[PDB]
Ligand binder design. Structure first.
Ligand code: Q77
Ligand code: Q77
Ligand code: Q77
Ligand code: ZN
Length: 257
């Protein structure tokens, strides 16, 4: 029932998911002059060399690439994190126009899209248990701006025609998510939530300062996806982002000066 339309979008979600008005909701605006450099934060460790992608799917709210998370093959460690977090999937949020689409903002700036690499804390054994814990998930958020093409994204873009409508999936093996990362791993971090229902407050957010650049043709292909299913009235999948939420009693920490 929930979505991004006028009658079921973010301003409605609290009725089914009252945690939408909770104390650690995401996304947030990152005020760069208020975030504090924390020298105790460790460098991020992104170990994706053994990643095993499985499928790509249109779930009616975004498209997602899934990974085999039954072993420590693609893990995130370090930074603000204690322990080992396994990569489960990645997906994007994007706009109808290049000036909007990201969920997090930086000094109120909206990027054209935002990539979420979703990882779960192995001490909880499975992702369903992890989402019930305040430190269960670590999502690596990466901004996209429009400029030069991102070669490591092209394989994703070229298969989207095969998952145009909700419920469609396709084989997506041998995809290397390292090709979606910027050069720098400098980041901001804060405790937050999933950005769609059920809005569970289980996420350590790690948002990279350096955006990746994608081409206008690449983001245009995101915008040709459909929220609807096959044989239904076509509604383009655009503006699948939640706006910034109240920071409340949180501090955003920076890994860099
Ligand atoms: C009619 C309509 C318009 C928009 C933007 C929608 C939906 C329907 S929707 O498909 O019900 N789900 C969604 O996310 N956005
Ligand atoms: C535990 C869990 C719950 C929900 C609603 C999820 C996922 C995991 S998920 O697999 O990360 N992808 C998704 O779209 N919804
Ligand atoms: C685990 C998970 C589940 C869902 C539905 C999510 C996310 C993570 S997410 O990365 O916060 N972004 C989003 O829109 N939905
Ligand atoms: Zn997301």
């Amino acid at each position: 029932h929930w979505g991004y339309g006028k009658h079921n979008g973010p301003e409605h979600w609290h009725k089914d998911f009252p945690i939408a008005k909770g104390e650690r909701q995401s996304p947030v605006d990152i005020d760069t002059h208020t975030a504090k450099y924390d020298p105790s934060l460790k460098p991020l460790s992104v170990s994706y060399d053994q990643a095993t992608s499985l499928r790509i799917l249109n779930n009616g709210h975004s498209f997602q690439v899934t990974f085999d998370d039954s072993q420590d093959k693609a893990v995130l460690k370090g930074g603000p994190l204690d322990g080992t977090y396994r990569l489960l999937q990645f997906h994007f949020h994007w706009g109808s126009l290049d000036g909007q689409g990201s969920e997090h903002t930086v000094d109120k700036k909206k990027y054209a899209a935002e990539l979420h690499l979703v990882h779960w804390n192995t001490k909880y054994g499975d992702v369903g248990k992890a989402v019930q814990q305040p430190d269960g998930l670590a999502v690596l958020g990466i901004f996209l701006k429009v400029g030069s093409a991102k070669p490591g994204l092209q394989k994703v873009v070229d298969v989207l025609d095969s998952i145009k409508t909700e419920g469609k999936s396709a084989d997506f093996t041998n995809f290397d998510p390292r090709g979606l990362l910027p050069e720098s791993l400098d980041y901001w971090t804060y405790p937050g939530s999933l950005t769609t229902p059920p809005l569970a407050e289980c996420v350590t957010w790690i948002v990279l300062k350096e955006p990746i650049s994608v081409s206008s043709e690449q983001v245009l292909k995101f915008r040709k996806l459909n929220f609807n299913g096959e044989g239904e009235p076509e509604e383009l999948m655009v503006d699948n982002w939640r706006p910034a939420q109240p920071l409340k009693n949180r501090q955003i920490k920076a890994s860099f000066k």
